[model samples]
Target: HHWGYGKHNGPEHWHKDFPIAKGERQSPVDIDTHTAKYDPSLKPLSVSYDQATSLRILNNGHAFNVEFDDSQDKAVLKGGPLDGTYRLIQFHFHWGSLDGQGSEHTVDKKKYAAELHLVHWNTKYGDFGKAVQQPDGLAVLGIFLKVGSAKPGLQKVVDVLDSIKTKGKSADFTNFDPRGLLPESLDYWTYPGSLTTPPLLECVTWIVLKEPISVSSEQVLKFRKLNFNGEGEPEELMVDNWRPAQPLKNRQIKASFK
Candidate 1:
């Protein structure tokens, strides 16, 4: 019943419980840009998110997530290597023990400080759960994070960490736009991948942005303070919560830009 980034239950051990951990289309793969093929036909990304749909943030014993009300098409992603509209469901982050060792996906083996995952489900699949079972059901926008200038937009999210420090804790997070945290460029790399979590469902079309956003060192440290254990349990630091990059398995990495 326990799965985490610990030595006993980390990514390397996940396949023992979930066979898909060793699946061919697993996520968090290293992106080798030099080898990646650039496709001129790849459409520009279209992201439209409504701040009103922002509901609350939760610490799910694994990662801190900002959930959105996907009841309507108010916040949706489309036109980016997608066949149809996908509604924004939730967004989360993955980091390491510190700024130098985070990020799930890498660029030519270059790791970032952290990585952001903006999860969305295909409208055709009806809901996230169902979408996770189909091949073309989910679309996740991945954005890399680097330590530099303080990100005011990210600070709003960091400020709420104290409230949801423990596992299962959540707080109201309203009028917040996920788009505010995106870098200037929309250029990205696309591929087939899995959930990067248990069950490791290979139902995602990953759109990882080439540009990285800035997050000050102070802000980077805030994520480490979150606890994996809830109240009344021994506190365990929630760091190094990123899965190591899986093999490419010769999968084509299509770039949206030159």
Candidate 2:
């Protein structure tokens, strides 16, 4: 009945409800390193976050979201493709049933275990609702996750999964900084795109990190335990919650470094 990563209602079918799904600048494109131009004019990315802003974490049936306090500019992303500062509102993950099959954007067709999306809205509009409909409304910072040493920073969020394992569930989450999950290098590729999920608005400026953070397979399996179903519905694991890489069209994938 709704848009979901199901056999019938998955990404391929989203255009039925949101026609822009088939439009230019769709997101999660395969980042071809060879084709990505080195943009020397691009400045080093900047992030300033207030630990107090991390408010709560919830499972919205599609993906689990950790929301933040966007009333102020304490948390913001600037430079490297963003003209104005974008405020962090929430962050979430996209994964697959199997580890390597999860990541939405690939590199030379290579896949990672998962991907993280830190959703930010441009403060030029001073409001997310109005800005969301504009051309430069949002910026989604993506980080790929591969199987490696356990990341203690990520462990904090994983531990909370048990508290909000099902759809429509949430828990008090605070005093945390989402930047802890980012790779040491802020190197990334930039392009214009749409929201990966429904309402598929073509207003996002995607900045995907080149170096991926690591997470052991054991830790990722925990994310799979989250249920897409609500309390009374039959249980269904919320795995493979990622949109397939869309056509790159005529867009350019600019790199921050050579």
Model 1 TM-score (2 dp):
0.97
Q: Estimated TM-score per prediction?
A: 0.97, 0.97
lDDT of 1 by residue, 176-205 (tens): 977689899899899988888888889999
Regions more than 4 Å wrong, model 1: none
Under the 3 Å rule for N, CA and C atoms, how many clashes does model 1 have?
A: 0
Question: Model 2 Cα displacement at 204 (Å)?
Answer: 0.8
Q: What does each candidate score in C-alpha RMSD?
A: 1.1, 1.1
